Amino acid sequence: TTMRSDNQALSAVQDALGLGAAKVDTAYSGMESAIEVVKEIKAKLVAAT
Amino acid sequence: TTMRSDNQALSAVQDALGLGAAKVDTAYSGMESAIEVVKEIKAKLVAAT
Structure with missing residues (x-):
C-alpha cells in the first residue's frame, strides 16, 4: 500500500515535471x-559608428 | 553565438569600410x-611674368 502511494506520488511528480x-x-x-x-x-549600432 | 555576433559586427565594419x-x-x-x-x-602666371 505504501509503495502504491509512492508510485502515485511519483506519477504526479512526473506530470509536474x-x-x-x-x-x-x-x-x-x-x-x-x-x-x-x-x-x-548590436550590429545596427556598430554600423551606426 | 559570440562568434556569430562578431561576424555580424565585421560585416557592418565592411559596409562602413x-x-x-x-x-x-x-x-x-x-x-x-x-x-x-x-x-x-601657375603655368599661366609664369607665362605672364
Whole structure:
C-alpha cells in the first residue's frame, strides 16, 4: 500500500515535471528570440559608428 | 553565438569600410582636379611674368 502511494506520488511528480519542461521550453524560446534581436541591435549600432 | 555576433559586427565594419572608400575616392578625384587647375594657374602666371 505504501509503495502504491509512492508510485502515485511519483506519477504526479512526473506530470509536474512535464509542465515545468514546457514552461522552460517556452521561456528558452523567448530567450533565443531576445538573443537574435539584441544581436541585430548590436550590429545596427556598430554600423551606426 | 559570440562568434556569430562578431561576424555580424565585421560585416557592418565592411559596409562602413566601403562607404569610407567611396568617400576617399571622391575626395581624391576632387583633389586631383584642383591640383590640375592650380598647375594651369601657375603655368599661366609664369607665362605672364
